[PDB]
Amino acid sequence: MENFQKVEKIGEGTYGVVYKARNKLTGEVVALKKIVPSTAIREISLLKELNHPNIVKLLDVIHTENKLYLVFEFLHQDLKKFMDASALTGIPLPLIKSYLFQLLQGLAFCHSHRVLHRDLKPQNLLINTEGAIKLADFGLARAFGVPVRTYTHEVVTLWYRAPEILLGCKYYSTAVDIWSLGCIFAEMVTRRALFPGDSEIDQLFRIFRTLGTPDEVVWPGVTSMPDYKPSFPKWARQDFSKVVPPLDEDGRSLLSQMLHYDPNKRISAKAALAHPFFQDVTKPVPHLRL
Ligand SMILES: Nc1ncnc2c1ncn2[C@@H]1O[C@H](COP(=O)(O)OP(=O)(O)OP(=O)(O)O)[C@@H](O)[C@H]1O
Ligand SMILES: [Mg+2]
């Protein structure tokens, strides 16, 4: 790991600390994550073969001295910062659209190989100057664990967590990433998080107050999930037209099928790509200050 000069601490997070760095041989500019379990080594290593244009490439895995270093392709900005920069104005719809479409291609790819992200959030979505958006940190949650408290005391977000994970479903599927990207999609449109919980019960209860408390009608098997409680308050669903207002009906219709309560009814990434909302999809360039 001495083959890299550290330029700047990009950030810290669940697994470790990310630095911008330079290859002392190549001159290649990379993101170097400093995170070892053998199971975790083999799984990280098969992720190296998961290449796709909307997936941040894992250049190399440097395992030395009980220390693990993940060297990724570097991108100049994440979606959280692009969003904070665009607050006043909002992200134009055609770019939101391009972004959702490309993230769906990324998910269709990984899901077809049976790999889930499990932790999608605006900081894990990286963008460049040509209009591309890529998923970062795919596969890592299953390969190492997803802690309560991110490494540097920071608390991983729950705002994007699917309801079956919150209800203690042990074997959740690729549908959990479609739930999370739906919540991001909504947030790009409105400029405000859809479900900002600050705890697991608050998270749940914020989902219940917009989409209605789920029951055996909308979701067969829900009432015998491990953290389901018959004492949960019964709240009615609200309409999407109030939820993500500006969005047109193709957009709300796609969003509502991404937010289905039952993960077997939730749209897959491959069906979502054929949805009529994407009929006029283009690829615009964003306005970016590096
Ligand atoms: N490949 C990369 N290129 C450029 N910047 C990156 C890259 N990967 C990560 N960063 C940015 O570095 C910061 C730290 O990323 P990090 O993975 O540690 O945290 P996170 O995405 O916020 O949470 P999590 O640990 O769950 O991934 C975030 O701002 C991330 O967007
Ligand atoms: Mg990350």
Curated annotation (Swiss-Prot):
Q: What is the effect of changing residue 37 to L?
A: In a glioblastoma multiforme sample; somatic mutation
Looking at the UniProt record, the site noted as CDK7 binding sits at 9, 80-81, 158
Q: Which reaction does it catalyse?
A: L-seryl-[protein] + ATP = O-phospho-L-seryl-[protein] + ADP + H(+); L-threonyl-[protein] + ATP = O-phospho-L-threonyl-[protein] + ADP + H(+)
Q: Please tell me which top-level EC class this enzyme sits in.
A: transferase
Entry superkingdom? Eukaryota
| Induction comment from the UniProt entry of this chain | Induced transiently by TGFB1 at an early phase of TGFB1-mediated apoptosis.
Which residues does the record list as N6-acetyllysine (modified residue)? 6
Hey, what's the signal peptide range on this chain?
none
The UniProt note on how this protein's activity is regulated states: Phosphorylation at Thr-14 or Tyr-15 inactivates the enzyme, while phosphorylation at Thr-152 activates it.
Q: Which cofactor does it need?
A: Mg(2+)
- Name its GO BP terms in alphabetical order: cell division; cellular response to nitric oxide; cellular senescence; centriole replication; centrosome duplication; chromatin remodeling; DNA repair; DNA replication
Question: Where found, per UniProt?
Answer: Cytoplasm, Cytoskeleton, Microtubule organizing center, Centrosome; Nucleus, Cajal body; Cytoplasm; Endosome
- What molecular function does GO assign, one term? cyclin-dependent protein kinase activity
Q: Explain what the record says happens when changing residue 15 to F.
A: 2-fold increase in activity
Q: List its EC numbers.
A: 2.7.11.22
Q: Reproduce the UniProt comment on modification after translation.
A: Phosphorylated at Thr-152 by CDK7 in a CAK complex. Phosphorylation at Thr-152 promotes kinase activity, whereas phosphorylation at Tyr-15 by WEE1 reduces slightly kinase activity. Phosphorylated on Thr-14 and Tyr-15 during S and G2 phases before being dephosphorylated by CDC25A.
Q: Where does ATP bind?
A: 10-18, 33, 73-75, 78, 121-124, 137
Q: Subunit details for this protein?
A: Found in a complex with CABLES1, CCNA1 and CCNE1. Interacts with CABLES1. Interacts with UHRF2. Part of a complex consisting of UHRF2, CDK2 and CCNE1. Interacts with the Speedy/Ringo proteins SPDYA and SPDYC. Interaction with SPDYA promotes kinase activation via a conformation change that alleviates obstruction of the substrate-binding cleft by the T-loop. Found in a complex with both SPDYA and CDKN1B/KIP1. Binds to RB1 and CDK7.
Function in brief? Serine/threonine-protein kinase involved in the control of the cell cycle; essential for meiosis, but dispensable for mitosis. Phosphorylates CABLES1, CTNNB1, CDK2AP2, ERCC6, NBN, USP37, p53/TP53, NPM1, CDK7, RB1, BRCA2, MYC, NPAT, EZH2. Triggers duplication of centrosomes and DNA.
What is the protein name for this chain?
Answer: Cyclin-dependent kinase 2
The species this protein was found in: Homo sapiens
